[PDB]
Automatic annotation (TrEMBL), chains A, B:
One Pfam family here: RVP
Source species taxonomy: Viruses, Riboviria, Pararnavirae, Artverviricota, Revtraviricetes
Organism field: Human immunodeficiency virus type 1 (HIV-1)
Peptidase A2 domain sequence ranges: 20-89
PROSITE patterns in the cross-refs: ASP_PROT_RETROV, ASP_PROTEASE
Broad class of the protein's primary localization: host cell
Protein name listed in UniProt: Protease
């Protein structure tokens, strides 16, 4: 699709067998999802941005279907105010900014 | 242009006669810049990022160039770690996310 930016670019994603709404976020390096279970090993890390830092659990090789497009990569899980699809997965679905 | 996302979508902007680096961010509702002087009166606003909310100064009808594209609109100033071009100005310059 071609998504205009009058509203937040929210899409449905499928992760860990669950449907979630998430923000397509060119300003995010990483994909950050609210608390959920994911399989496999994980490693803690901190993410800091506007407002300060939160602690997240990093899971590797997680598949996510984003608006119908499959991608695999690292997903971090933690107390984010909004589910965020960041550049590590936007590249995989071929998303670009155009103007 | 068409900007891929393998690296951060950083561009040069011009505001108050000065060049600065900023992030094109589809996950930001508004445009927030690091501390600088802008003309006119400002209004209070808060913006929420990954770690909580910050207070910013909202200036309206500010002249700003984004990657060579002229715009006039709302710019907020505050303690952001990175200059952010958000959806208000991305929409004005015709940007869309495509995949
Ligand atoms: C939501 C909003 C409303 C009004 C105005 C603004 C600017 C708004 O956006 C605020 C905001 O922080 N939006 C984020 C996503 C957002 C929207 C709504 C709520 C919470 C978050 C995101 O897009 C941009 C922001 C930029 C950033 C800031 C400081 C340092 C580095 C980068 N990016 C990050 O925080 C990312 C996180 C998400 C992995 N990040 C931080 C670790 C280093 N690298 C990195 O990429
Ligand atoms: Cl990844
Ligand atoms: Cl590509
Ligand atoms: Cl505006
Ligand atoms: Na894993």
């Amino acid at each position: 699709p071609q998504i205009t930016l009058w509203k937040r670019p929210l899409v449905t994603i499928k992760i860990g067998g669950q449907l979630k709404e998430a923000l397509l976020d060119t300003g995010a390096d990483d994909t950050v999802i609210e608390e959920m279970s994911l399989p496999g090993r994980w490693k803690p890390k901190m993410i800091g941005g506007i407002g300060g830092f939160i602690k997240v659990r990093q899971y590797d090789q997680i598949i996510i279907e984003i608006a119908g497009h499959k991608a695999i990569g690292t997903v971090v899980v933690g107390p984010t105010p909004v589910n965020i699809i960041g550049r590590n997965l936007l590249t995989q679905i071929g998303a670009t900014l155009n103007f």
